[PDB]
Design an enzyme around this catalytic site. Structure first.
Site, PDB file in Angstrom:
ATOM      1  N   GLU A   1       0.801  -1.200   0.000  1.00  0.00           N
ATOM      2  CA  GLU A   1       0.000   0.000   0.000  1.00  0.00           C
ATOM      3  C   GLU A   1       0.847   1.269   0.000  1.00  0.00           C
ATOM      4  O   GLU A   1       1.795   1.403   0.781  1.00  0.00           O
ATOM      5  CB  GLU A   1      -0.885  -0.041   1.245  1.00  0.00           C
ATOM      6  CG  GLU A   1      -1.840   1.120   1.395  1.00  0.00           C
ATOM      7  CD  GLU A   1      -2.630   1.095   2.702  1.00  0.00           C
ATOM      8  OE1 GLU A   1      -2.508   0.136   3.501  1.00  0.00           O
ATOM      9  OE2 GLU A   1      -3.381   2.060   2.933  1.00  0.00           O
TER      10      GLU A   1
ATOM     11  N   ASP B   1       0.270   5.072   0.576  1.00  0.00           N
ATOM     12  CA  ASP B   1      -0.633   6.129   0.990  1.00  0.00           C
ATOM     13  C   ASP B   1      -0.083   7.469   0.606  1.00  0.00           C
ATOM     14  O   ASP B   1       0.727   8.053   1.314  1.00  0.00           O
ATOM     15  CB  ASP B   1      -0.879   6.092   2.487  1.00  0.00           C
ATOM     16  CG  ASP B   1      -1.584   4.845   2.908  1.00  0.00           C
ATOM     17  OD1 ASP B   1      -2.575   4.483   2.239  1.00  0.00           O
ATOM     18  OD2 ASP B   1      -1.132   4.213   3.883  1.00  0.00           O
TER      19      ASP B   1
ATOM     20  N   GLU C   1      -3.296  10.994   3.276  1.00  0.00           N
ATOM     21  CA  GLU C   1      -4.194  10.662   4.370  1.00  0.00           C
ATOM     22  C   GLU C   1      -4.223  12.008   5.051  1.00  0.00           C
ATOM     23  O   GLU C   1      -3.202  12.465   5.571  1.00  0.00           O
ATOM     24  CB  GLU C   1      -3.618   9.563   5.251  1.00  0.00           C
ATOM     25  CG  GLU C   1      -3.707   8.224   4.577  1.00  0.00           C
ATOM     26  CD  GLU C   1      -3.424   7.103   5.524  1.00  0.00           C
ATOM     27  OE1 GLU C   1      -4.383   6.621   6.157  1.00  0.00           O
ATOM     28  OE2 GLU C   1      -2.246   6.709   5.652  1.00  0.00           O
TER      29      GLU C   1
ATOM     30  N   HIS D   1       4.005   1.440   2.617  1.00  0.00           N
ATOM     31  CA  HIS D   1       3.912   0.210   3.455  1.00  0.00           C
ATOM     32  C   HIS D   1       4.285  -1.059   2.705  1.00  0.00           C
ATOM     33  O   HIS D   1       3.490  -1.564   1.909  1.00  0.00           O
ATOM     34  CB  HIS D   1       2.486  -0.097   3.934  1.00  0.00           C
ATOM     35  CG  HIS D   1       1.840   0.996   4.713  1.00  0.00           C
ATOM     36  ND1 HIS D   1       1.683   0.944   6.085  1.00  0.00           N
ATOM     37  CD2 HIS D   1       1.251   2.142   4.306  1.00  0.00           C
ATOM     38  CE1 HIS D   1       1.025   2.017   6.486  1.00  0.00           C
ATOM     39  NE2 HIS D   1       0.751   2.758   5.428  1.00  0.00           N
TER      40      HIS D   1
END
Ligand code: NAG
Ligand code: BGC
Ligand code: IBZ
Ligand code: CA
Length: 434
Positions: free
Chosen positions: A212, A214, A217, A228
């Site tokens: 993942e 991101d 956020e 991640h």
């Protein structure tokens, strides 16, 4: 799960731009699809729900297999039920939508066609988008990120899944989510534990893991950029506490890194860069452009544009690290100064490169946090910590903020608007749109 048609499925259209090294960008037409978890799940031959509240029908769903054979997902009324609307290159997600039921948030994917997801290869490229976070108070998270999902939603690997991408199946992320109702063509009824604080959700015996990225956020108070890695790059089912993540006994026991090597400007010391009002470099009451570059070394760069003025990611000094680039040195210093070894144990940026070198699906969401009240993003976390603890303060929100029931009733009209998505080789997205 199979698909039913009691309610039709019409994906709201969304245009985006694909740019080239030659200096031109061209319009692309896609559409968005809502995740399966938000859909009406009922018997294939009747309107009898297979799932209601936070419990499964014990007769229709005695086990994972039987449940999947008996149950289907149905269509979504995007605007009226989910508060999801699109207009040209713009996508808005409303927080709370009250129809015959109360709906909170949405998780959406960008589609290549009516039956498949758009895959993006990030390495060597950059992604740009505009965002209006002005209506997102403490406790909320308007997220835009990438996950290593299959283009067909898992249909080719799991035959009992005949709904596919068209119905938003196949989700996975680095948290190895166990709240998913359907994973790998089967239901997640075995081991289901209803949530003590959420009438509509639960935790099953299986989870779905994958890499993942991101990219964003955020809310009007704080923002974070976080890669991640996972030891298995793509989607893979996990079992029980071996999943790791938030709802497992050993958070770091799974195959994915649930923490990530995060970059939050406020957490790193610059408390004047991003926030509501003119006293901040980037004023969150106004729209802003966010550009993220993935260089071939595995490092990540970031710059922002607001009112025509460009601002590179602000400099941070963390131990022996000084700079504004999310690289190996930054991630190592972060672990040394703030603690943890999850990111490095999962392979760091080198393992993450395997994900960005492959295809990843674009996800856009709006959510509140029933586990940690979004404190990890915009407040002091853990709450017993002080500002003297390295990395404890992530934003200016009170440690009493973010209670889901409270924000749902106080700010039901909250929303996030993502627009003008552009993707292409590094240095290309700032060029004229087609
Ligand atoms: C925060 O970042 C902005 C943009 O780089 C910079 O102008 C400002 O001096 C920084 N403030 C602090 C306290 O580091
Ligand atoms: O699970 C909530 C959050 O946990 C922390 C991670 O850094 C985020 O990427 C994640 O969204
Ligand atoms: S990824 C934020 C976080 C980090 C460590 C423990 C719990 C939580 I939520
Ligand atoms: Ca570099």
């Amino acid at each position: 799960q199979s698909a039913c048609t009691l309610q039709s499925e019409t994906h709201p259209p969304l245009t985006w731009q694909k740019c080239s090294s030659g200096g031109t960008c061209t319009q692309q037409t896609g559409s968005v699809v809502i995740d399966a978890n938000w859909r009406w799940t009922h018997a294939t031959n009747s309107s009898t729900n297979c799932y209601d509240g936070n419990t499964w029908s014990s007769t229709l769903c005695p086990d994972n297999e039987t449940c999947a054979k008996n149950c289907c997902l149905d269509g979504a009324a995007y605007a009226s039920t989910y508060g999801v609307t699109t207009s040209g290159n713009s996508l808005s997600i409303g927080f709370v939508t009250q129809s015959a039921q109360k709906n909170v948030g949405a998780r959406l994917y960008l589609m290549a066609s009516d039956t498949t997801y758009q895959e993006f290869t990030l390495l060597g490229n950059e992604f740009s988008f505009d965002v209006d976070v002005s209506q997102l108070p403490c406790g909320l998270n308007g997220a835009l990120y990438f996950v290593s999902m299959d283009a067909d939603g898992g249909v080719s690997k799991y035959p009992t899944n005949t709904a596919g991408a068209k119905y938003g199946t196949g989700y996975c992320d680095s948290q190895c989510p166990r709240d998913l109702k359907f994973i790998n063509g089967q239901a997640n009824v075995e081991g289901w534990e209803p949530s003590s604080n959420n009438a509509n959700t639960g935790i099953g015996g299986h989870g779905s893991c994958c890499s993942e990225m991101d990219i964003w956020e955020a809310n009007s108070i704080s923002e974070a950029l976080t890669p991640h890695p996972c030891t298995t790059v793509g989607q893979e089912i996990c079992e029980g506490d071996g999943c790791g993540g938030t709802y497992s006994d050993n958070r770091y026991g799974g195959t994915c890194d649930p923490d990530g090597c995060d970059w939050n400007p406020y957490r790193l010391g610059n408390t004047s860069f991003y926030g509501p009002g003119s006293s901040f470099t980037l004023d969150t009451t106004k729209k802003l452009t966010v550009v993220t570059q993935f260089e071939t070394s595995g490092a990540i760069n970031r710059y922002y544009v607001q009112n025509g003025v460009t601002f590179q990611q602000p400099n941070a000094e963390l131990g022996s690290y000084s700079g504004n680039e999310l690289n190996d040195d930054y991630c190592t210093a972060e672990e040394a100064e703030f603690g943890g070894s999850s990111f490095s144990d999962k392979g760091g940026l080198t393992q993450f490169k395997k994900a960005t070198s492959g295809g990843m699906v674009l996800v856009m969401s709006l959510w509140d946090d029933y586990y940690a009240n979004m404190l990890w993003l915009d407040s002091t976390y853990p709450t017993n910590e002080t500002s003297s603890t390295p990395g404890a303060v992530r934003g200016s929100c009170s440690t009493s903020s973010g209670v889901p029931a409270q924000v749902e009733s106080q700010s039901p009209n909250a929303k996030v608007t993502f627009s003008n998505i552009k993707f292409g080789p590094i240095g290309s997205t700032g060029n004229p749109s087609g």
